[PDB]
Design a protein around this ligand. Structure first.
Ligand code: MG
Ligand code: MG
Ligand code: MG
Ligand code: MG
Ligand code: MG
Ligand code: MG
Ligand code: MG
Ligand code: MG
Ligand code: MG
Ligand code: MG
Ligand code: MG
Ligand code: MG
Ligand code: MG
Ligand code: MG
Ligand code: MG
Ligand code: MG
Ligand code: MG
Ligand code: MG
Ligand code: MG
Ligand code: MG
Ligand code: MG
Ligand code: MG
Ligand code: MG
Ligand code: MG
Ligand code: MG
Ligand code: MG
Ligand code: MG
Ligand code: MG
Ligand code: MG
Ligand code: MG
Ligand code: MG
Ligand code: MG
Ligand code: MG
Ligand code: MG
Ligand code: MG
Ligand code: MG
Ligand code: MG
Ligand code: MG
Ligand code: MG
Ligand code: MG
Ligand code: MG
Ligand code: MG
Ligand code: MG
Ligand code: MG
Ligand code: MG
Ligand code: MG
Ligand code: MG
Ligand code: MG
Ligand code: MG
Ligand code: MG
Ligand code: MG
Ligand code: MG
Ligand code: MG
Lengths: 195, 113
RNA sequence: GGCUACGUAGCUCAGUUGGUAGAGCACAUCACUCAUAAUGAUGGGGUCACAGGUUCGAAUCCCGUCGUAGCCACCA
RNA sequence: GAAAGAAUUAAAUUAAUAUAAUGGUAUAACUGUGCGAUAAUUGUAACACAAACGAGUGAAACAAGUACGUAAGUAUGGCAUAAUGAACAAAUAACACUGAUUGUAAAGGUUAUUGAUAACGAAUAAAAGUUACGCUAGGGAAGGGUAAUAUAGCGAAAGAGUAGAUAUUGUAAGCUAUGUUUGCCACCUUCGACUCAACAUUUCCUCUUGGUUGUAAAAGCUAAGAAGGGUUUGACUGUUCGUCAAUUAAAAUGUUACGUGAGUUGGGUUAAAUACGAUGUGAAUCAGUAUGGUUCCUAUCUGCUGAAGGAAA
RNA sequence: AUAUAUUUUAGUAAUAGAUAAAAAUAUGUACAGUAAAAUUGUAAGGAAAACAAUAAUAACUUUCUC
RNA sequence: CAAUCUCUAAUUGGUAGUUUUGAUGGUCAUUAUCAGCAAAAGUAUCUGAAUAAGUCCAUAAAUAAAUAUAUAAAAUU
RNA sequence: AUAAUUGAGGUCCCGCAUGAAUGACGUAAUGAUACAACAACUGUCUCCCCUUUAAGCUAAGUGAAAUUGAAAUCGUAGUGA
RNA sequence: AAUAUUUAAAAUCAAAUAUAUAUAUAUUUGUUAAUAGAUAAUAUACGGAUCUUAAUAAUAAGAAUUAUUUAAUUCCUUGGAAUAUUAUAUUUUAAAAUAUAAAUACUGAAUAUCUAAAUAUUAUUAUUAUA
RNA sequence: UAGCCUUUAUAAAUAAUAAUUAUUAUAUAAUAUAUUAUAUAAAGAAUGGUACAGCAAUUAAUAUAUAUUAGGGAACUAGUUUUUUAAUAAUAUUAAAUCUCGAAAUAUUUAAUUAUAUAUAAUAAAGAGUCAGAUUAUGUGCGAUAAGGUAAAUAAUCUAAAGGGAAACAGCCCAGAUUAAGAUAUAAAGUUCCUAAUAAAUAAUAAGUGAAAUAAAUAUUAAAAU
């Protein structure tokens, strides 16, 4: 509903920033969560405007609405407010006025997701290709068995990466603050703190 | 047009004296906005929460179990002392005065009340 | 920072050189006219500008600052 | 087993903080309450932080006095970081320091206090415009870059096309090229006409060819090859352009310092004169209108057009 | 029971608790305490007036008791 | 009266000497807070600010609260 | 009006932003003023051609000028204050 | 063969290094190409020539592009050893055997060294005449 | 005026610059469950909140044949169910200049030790010049993730630096000219010729692709792996 037009109460101008190249191997929003088939970015990290996203959504919908129990999950919201000065105006003299909403999209991230009752995968693939024709990146069809993109030419299965109880790890190799707290909890300090 | 071209300078609010550093009485160990560091052993605190040394010694940053979730800056009277000092041991104190070996000076001091 | 002189009724204005709550004025009802209205008579509200003293007796004198613009000073 | 107390643990600083925002604050800096109303005191302040100077900030300690607290102690205004202004010249007090012959005085000094210089390190107590009649010293304290726009193309194809997205058409969004427009940058300080044109091809005509339920024929439409040859004369306007008239096989689009003023012109743009409308108190002014109105050059080199001499044939 | 005299009371006014997030003295000091939101309710009361209630007691001290 | 000399006041582009900030098409110039600021500190531009400041708060809730009531004392009665 | 007129004249009046001695309006005459039309004329032009004289050119004599860091001073593309 | 993905060393396998060590653990490395798309104005414009190899047939050429490498090739632990190569000499019948060598790729600065000269300073000397 | 530069000097002078040690844990050995030594591992005394990472709280975004709160319809005789409309909850998934509960490296930075002394700091007395900067790389603000643009941050070079390379070249890659000499090591860059110097190995390309200034989506044709 509000993914292409956030309702920040205090509307305000924003700096340009940069699209996060996720050097640490994030895989956040790079996985199929809601649907069966999806459309992910394949190229270098890119900014997608609100209008472009809307058009992609519309393109996808043409295939989704005919389906029985058809659904489209829009995975990303255009949260960054972009202002622009005109091409007509000189440089300097303040910042330009609000123009459009935009989203910073890392390399591996999923944009859309679909799942119908009577949805064959070929149709879904076609729809997602047609959606990609309207967006500024280069995109890729992603199924539930197809594995998570991280880099431009690199891949990963989330099933592989290890599970860890971090409290236990902390206890094993404790910080100074934690040790101080533990000492405080002990009786030769707790009795004589005198509050 | 109307531009937002106005800002105060930076308040120089780092630590002004570091761990293991020799100090003198009066010297500022920390400038800060509110007690990020609390005044520890042999150390005072000012109006602007500025930690300053009460005695000559060695600046030490530490945690104390009595005050968990609070960082401290204190001044150890020597380099030998671990400055979160043992609680039930006697306080390491500085006399900090000198006897008036000079006779006249001693006499003057005796006279003065 | 000091010094003035003015601020009655909803409107306009008296009154002022002390022993007064007065006047038309626009406003609502009767009156008169064929039927309007001009004209004739009904009444209307004032802490006599916030607020204290001297004469049994001051709206008027004296006397605190509200207020309105002045005036002086200081203006390096 | 029960009651009461002491409390501890968890959570919380999201409330509250005189006031912005940030940091801090429950051990509370927040809140309530007694006393008080004192420390919103007086002389010396080292040493640090910050820092060009001028200033600014934290502050141990020594001495005088005060308030609260059983005491320990705490208080030199406010949880902190804004809340401000130099000298000079005046003004008011206190000080007992100087007292221009001596004594008084005046006047100056010390100490405390006063009002502003917001263009806010404050030039004076006190200062706005105009010039196309202008002058001097200097500085540059279309080309180049860019490609948002513009022009052209490509991919995908919603949708028109009597039916069929792709004969022809092709929304909004996607990917490029160009440096032909309008911009942006600031390295770098004249429009049109005439004359002669050279180059490009993104081809307007002519030649070859693919597609065209939308190629029966004929006219077309669209696309590929193709730059050999060719591609206008008049009325209006300074105009390029545009409107129209009459033609043409066609009347293509650019580049060349938007080719070409040491080749011509000077209608536009342009200074001195003048008037009009508007603006201004005015001098005068204008992304205004109108009449008038100033540059010249024998060619040294390059280059090109012709013509000789010398030469190694 | 009634008369006079001399007095006394009635000026009728909130805090009764070291009060603790209604409002009020914004700097000192001493002592003490904890806010807010949300939720469940309740006369007018309704989304929005007020009041109530809403985390855990192991160990410790004292008291009574099987 | 008026004229002249000396003093004093009103008026003046009549006339003379000067001036017309730095940054911009009325707005910004001093101070504080955060971001920009890249985990010390500092850090700019006609950068973004729900930006904020030229302050505000004091002489006050007092007085009374132990020798007392007739008579007699004054070792506290 | 012209084959065709952003010019000229006539007329209309949302006069962006006319107006009465900063005069208003309509005429006769005048004007090397400015704009437009008709006639006549023409080398202005279609479209240039021929001729004449003075230069230009050559020989003799006399003899400048601006300019000039030094020059043994080609094209193209690239580069580069 | 057919259909549909992916173009990957994360997982997986293989190979190598390091810790106890015939194994385990940890680390490191290994996963497409071509063409079209393609484009303006003085003149082709990798700096230019030019570069993709070919038997017969050479004492002889065969990227001068892209990617990963080496300094002849293979094991052992920069070094040695073996292997063939190449060149040469000797001996024997243009070949065979023996042995010697080459294997340190090279170019390259006004860098460094060496080689000499100068000045200045520091520290030692020698000779000659604040010695 | 300070910053940076120069000259002359001063010491009860190393205060300067660089690194190490400093910590945590494990195993082994020796003393009294602790201490010391040895070895190994760990981005390893103190200070920090950027990258990264994350969705906690704040600010934002999405989904539920899930639950609650009411509303709009709807079927039988006001009660009830369903298809729902918003809010709240629950669960799952997401991001931000002014969010950071996790969190680097670089950084700031302290003592002693070692190494630099033909070297540094500090102080004293004196002289300046400079206050138009440029480019390259990285991280940003503005611009349009445009500019040989603009604004600052860090480093280097140019400025003021000749020499080799990058065709030519202020700022790029090497390297700092006291004067020569030219044997030896070389740097960056090169070794068919122009032009100083070359031979190999294994793959791939056939397009002159390319050969020192890499042009995109997309299309076609192959090639591997599943
Ligand atoms: Mg992120
Ligand atoms: Mg700040
Ligand atoms: Mg406060
Ligand atoms: Mg706060
Ligand atoms: Mg400092
Ligand atoms: Mg100073
Ligand atoms: Mg306080
Ligand atoms: Mg003055
Ligand atoms: Mg005298
Ligand atoms: Mg000024
Ligand atoms: Mg100033
Ligand atoms: Mg000034
Ligand atoms: Mg002035
Ligand atoms: Mg004029
Ligand atoms: Mg250009
Ligand atoms: Mg159709
Ligand atoms: Mg379109
Ligand atoms: Mg036909
Ligand atoms: Mg063509
Ligand atoms: Mg021909
Ligand atoms: Mg004509
Ligand atoms: Mg031109
Ligand atoms: Mg010319
Ligand atoms: Mg010329
Ligand atoms: Mg004339
Ligand atoms: Mg004048
Ligand atoms: Mg911060
Ligand atoms: Mg910062
Ligand atoms: Mg930093
Ligand atoms: Mg910082
Ligand atoms: Mg006409
Ligand atoms: Mg004409
Ligand atoms: Mg007039
Ligand atoms: Mg006239
Ligand atoms: Mg005349
Ligand atoms: Mg002659
Ligand atoms: Mg040059
Ligand atoms: Mg691996
Ligand atoms: Mg070319
Ligand atoms: Mg080359
Ligand atoms: Mg040398
Ligand atoms: Mg100086
Ligand atoms: Mg040292
Ligand atoms: Mg930040
Ligand atoms: Mg944290
Ligand atoms: Mg400057
Ligand atoms: Mg620049
Ligand atoms: Mg210079
Ligand atoms: Mg150089
Ligand atoms: Mg240098
Ligand atoms: Mg040198
Ligand atoms: Mg080529
Ligand atoms: Mg090239």
């Amino acid at each position: 509903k509000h993914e292409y037009a956030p309702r920040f109460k205090i509307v305000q101008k924003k700096q340009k920033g940069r699209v996060p190249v996720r050097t640490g191997g994030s895989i956040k929003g790079s996985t199929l969560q809601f649907g069966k088939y999806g459309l992910r970015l394949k190229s270098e990290g890119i900014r997608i405007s609100a209008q472009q996203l809307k058009e992609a959504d519309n393109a996808i919908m043409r295939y989704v609405r005919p389906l029985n129990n058809g659904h489209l999950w829009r995975r990303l919201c255009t949260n960054v407010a972009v202002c622009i000065k005109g091409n007509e105006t000189r440089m300097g003299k303040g910042k330009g006025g609000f123009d459009h909403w935009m989203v910073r999209v890392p390399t591996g991230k999923i944009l859309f997701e679909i799942n119908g009752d009577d949805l064959h995968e070929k149709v879904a693939r076609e729809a997602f290709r047609k959606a990609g024709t309207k967006l500024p990146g280069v995109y890729e069809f992603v199924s539930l068995d197809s594995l998570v993109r991280v880099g431009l030419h690199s891949f990963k299965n989330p099933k592989d990466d290890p599970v860890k109880n971090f409290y236990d790890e902390n206890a094993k190799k404790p910080s100074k603050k934690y040790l101080n707290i533990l000492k405080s909890q002990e009786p030769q300090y707790k009795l004589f703190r005198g509050r | 047009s109307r531009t937002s071209m106005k800002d105060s300078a930076g308040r120089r609010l780092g630590p002004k004296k570091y761990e293991g550093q020799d100090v003198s009485t009066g010297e500022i160990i920390m400038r800060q906005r509110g007690t990020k560091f609390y005044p520890g052993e042999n150390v005072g605190i000012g109006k602007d929460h500025s930690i300053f040394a009460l005695e000559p010694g060695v600046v030490r940053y530490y945690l104390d179990p009595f005050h968990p979730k609070r960082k401290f800056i204190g001044v150890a009277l020597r380099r030998d002392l671990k400055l979160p000092s043992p609680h039930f041991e006697p306080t390491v104190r500085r006399f900090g005065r000198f006897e008036l070996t000079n006779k006249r000076a001693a006499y003057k001091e005796e006279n003065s009340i």
